[PDB]
């Protein structure tokens, strides 16, 4: 399948070179996989989700995304127009409030929730969790991410937007999960992207168009935007049977475009997520 005039990030993850505008992908499109988006929530009613999104848990008064961040990230995972894995099932877990903030204890609870809840869902091709959040180092938060990964969920987390070494941030700094940095449309490391030896992979993160609340769309930037590209790619590859939850991060790194990125500091991987699609 091919989507013409795709958002640049989708085109980029299906090409060996920057500057293309078509997203090429297998029609299976992540069908049979499930991705939990652990964030401010998801506007499940947005036409772009085609009824494939549901809120399953909230830690606040409502399950509504009053912010937009979670809806944007969910859109990049699996919306019709803006998504990597266009047929995947999306589950929303609201651990962040409508200002986009949340306590570490609530974030941990949300991770433990997903490890259990997945046992109640029909996801024959596997389960992914996308965490576009983080803050200062916490061994407890790292531990929660490690448990979630251990339980059989492919965990993808944002590296952070501090232009610093991600070793000082969580859950970015947990080695066992897939830590995602951001790039721009000219194959540069995004100016805000964290870096360091704990990064596993880069994905598109500057000027990413996706779904927003009120049935709208908008473009925003962050390692929050790169993370769902990798989460969606993982769901896509699991559905094709190329990899499993336990090994997807390594598979993505192995099959990445290598050496394409500029402004990568020594000691950080130069690897950009790539779907290897051939018609």
């Amino acid at each position: 399948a091919a989507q013409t005039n795709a958002p640049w990030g989708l085109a980029r993850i299906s090409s060996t070179s920057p500057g293309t505008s078509t997203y090429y992908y297998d029609e299976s499109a992540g069908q049979g996989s499930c991705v939990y988006v652990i964030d401010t929530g998801i506007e499940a009613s947005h036409p772009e989700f085609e009824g494939r999104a549901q809120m399953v848990k909230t830690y606040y008064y409502s399950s509504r995304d009053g912010n937009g961040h979670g809806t944007h990230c969910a859109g990049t995972v699996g919306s019709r127009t803006y998504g990597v894995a266009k047929k995947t099932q999306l589950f929303g877990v609201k651990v962040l409030d409508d200002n986009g903030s949340g306590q570490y204890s609530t974030i941990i609870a949300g991770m433990d929730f997903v490890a259990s809840d997945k046992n109640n869902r029909n996801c024959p091709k596997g389960v992914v969790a996308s965490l576009s959040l983080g803050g200062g180092y916490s061994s407890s938060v790292n531990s929660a991410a490690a448990r979630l990964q251990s339980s059989g969920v492919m965990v993808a987390v944002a590296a952070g937007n501090n232009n610093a070494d991600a070793r000082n941030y969580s859950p970015a700094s947990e080695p066992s999960v897939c830590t995602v940095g951001a790039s721009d449309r000219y194959d540069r490391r995004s100016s805000f992207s964290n870096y360091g030896s704990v990064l596993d992979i880069f994905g598109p993160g500057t000027d990413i168009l996706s779904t927003w609340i009120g049935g709208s769309t908008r473009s925003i930037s962050g390692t929050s935007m790169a993370t769902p590209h990798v989460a969606g790619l993982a769901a896509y590859l699991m559905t094709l049977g190329k990899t499993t939850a336990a090994s997807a991060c390594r598979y993505i790194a192995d099959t990445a475009n290598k050496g394409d990125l500029s402004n990568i500091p020594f000691g950080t991987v130069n690897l950009l997520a790539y779907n290897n699609y051939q018609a």
Binding site: N67, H69, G100, I107, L133, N161, F192, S224
Partner: peptide, 11 residues
Amino acid sequence: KLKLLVVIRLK
């Protein structure tokens, strides 16, 4: 959280 969600950006 300790990270983003603002919406009047930082570059």
